[PDB]
Amino acid sequence: DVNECVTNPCQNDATCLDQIGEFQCICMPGYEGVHCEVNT
Amino acid sequence: KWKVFIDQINRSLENYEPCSSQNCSCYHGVIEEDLTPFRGGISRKMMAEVVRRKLGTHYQITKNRLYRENDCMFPSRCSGVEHFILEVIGRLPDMEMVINVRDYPQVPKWMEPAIPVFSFSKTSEYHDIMYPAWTFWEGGPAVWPIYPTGLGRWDLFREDLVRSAAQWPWKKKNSTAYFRGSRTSPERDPLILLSRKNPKLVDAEYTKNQAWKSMKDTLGKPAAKDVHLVDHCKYKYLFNFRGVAASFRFKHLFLCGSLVFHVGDEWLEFFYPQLKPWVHYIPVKTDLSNVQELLQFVKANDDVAQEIAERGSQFIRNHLQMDDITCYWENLLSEYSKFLSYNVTRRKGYDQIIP
Ligand SMILES: O=c1ccn([C@@H]2O[C@H](COP(=O)(O)OP(=O)(O)O)[C@@H](O)[C@H]2O)c(=O)[nH]1
Ligand SMILES: *[C@@H]1O[C@H](CO)[C@@H](O)[C@H](O)[C@H]1NC(C)=O
Ligand SMILES: *[C@@H]1O[C@H](CO)[C@@H](O)[C@H](O)[C@H]1NC(C)=O
Ligand SMILES: *[C@@H]1O[C@H](CO)[C@@H](O)[C@H](O)[C@H]1NC(C)=O
Ligand SMILES: [Ca+2]
């Protein structure tokens, strides 16, 4: 499994979680999207 | 006492074939090399296998329109790639391709037959076809707080680095070598340890990346604060290392007007074959075993060191402009399309990429 979090995929000070052949960005409140790029 | 290095520099410069082109033709040899394994033609079955194996994101072009499968693990990287394809699609013939936007290449050379996958970085041990990375537009590492939405916009960053270089002419630059980055490869460790042993010689410290879990990820010390690339230009000697694959740091360091110390010679991006050791940068052995001799050498031969730094800066300034990125994309995909031995049919369910 590649840890995708090593390359900092999460924007806007989101937290990156490395999963089983995927990653997830946990956004700060106010942001959404795969990379936490959409500022609600 | 410097004869070995001085002679190496004279030899490398005598060997150097300068590029005089105003377009991206200086990188054509990279395209030719990367497409050589496919000279027998790419069949429909071969393409179907690459797609089934999910080695990258499947794109299709028909009638100057771009189509793509739904899934992209890194939407921002697909957007950066799409930015350039859409710029040139009005001049591209019908084709399809698989564009890997993960960091690491996908087609090791021991695989037979070769199958075509586009990746941003490889070594000579891979058959991936290099393309200009997404980050030239968007989608590079989001280093908080300096690049909150991801390292990108090479066009704008070029300008900022040139202004910063002007503030730090060579003679005003600090002679302690400098590095700020995270532990994306253990090949970086000996420099950080050398820095801790001899901080006047080297100022090299580990920052943290988004996978940081413990002090092991910074070699047992608190993480260093991240430092903008424009704030690198005050240092004469800037180190560059591989990470997961090649690093986006590399191209930026030249525009500081500083002398780049490039560690290793395996991991490439498409423009690297045109940057030549001793012509444009100081090559450092992968294991760093000659780094202290090289630092003494450049300090004792500062006129030569400056000549090398200026050549590297000029090369990036003149031959890695935004127009060179777009030109390479166009020429790469045009040349690649000639090797498809069949007529592409748009896949059911692939949405069009606009605008
Ligand atoms: O203090 C820092 C740390 C990183 N970066 C940039 O952020 C990107 C990621 O660097 P890192 O060392 O985390 O990974 P690499 O991609 O070099 O393996 C590269 O362009 C670095 O130049 C930067 O500008 N300042
Ligand atoms: C690109 O430059 C080369 C010379 O450097 C020239 O031969 C070629 O015709 C140019 N192509 C275009 C499309 O400008
Ligand atoms: C040069 O930079 C080093 C490392 O950052 C620093 O410790 C040193 O004081 C600087 N020297 C001068 C003269 O500014
Ligand atoms: C592929 O398309 C070309 C151009 O439209 C056509 O002339 C040719 O007959 C086709 N060949 C096939 C389907 O094998
Ligand atoms: Ca993973």
Residue numbers in the entry:
A (entry chain B): 452 to 491
B (entry chain A): 31 to 385
Relevant lines from the article:
POGLUT1 is an inverting GT-B fold (CAZy GT Family 9018) glycosyltransferase and its EGF-like domain substrates sit in a cleft formed between the canonical N-terminal and C-terminal domains. Here we report the structure of human POGLUT1 in complexes with three different EGF-like domains and either UDP, a donor substrate analog or a slow substrate. The three EGF-like domains studied are positioned almost identically in their respective complexes and 25–30% of their surface (740–830 Å2) is buried by POGLUT1.
To confirm this rationalization, we mutated the O-glucosylation site of hEGF12 to a threonine residue (hEGF12:S458T) and measured its ability to be glucosylated and determined its structure in complex with POGLUT1 and UDP. Consistent with the requirement for serine, the threonine mutant was not glucosylated, even at a concentration of 100 μM, and as shown by the structure, the conformation of the O-glucosylation motif was essentially unchanged. However, the threonine sidechain was found in the gauche (+) conformation (χ1 = 66°) where it hydrogen bonds to Arg107 of POGLUT1 and the carbonyl oxygen atom of the C1(−1) residue of hEGF12. In this rotamer, the threonine hydroxyl group is not positioned for in-line nucleophilic attack and its methyl group makes contact with the sidechain of Asp133, an interaction that shifts the Asp carboxyl group relative to that seen in all of the other complexes. Given the mainchain conformation of the O-glucosylation motif, only serine can access the sidechain rotamer required for activation and in-line nucleophilic attack on C1 of the donor substrate.
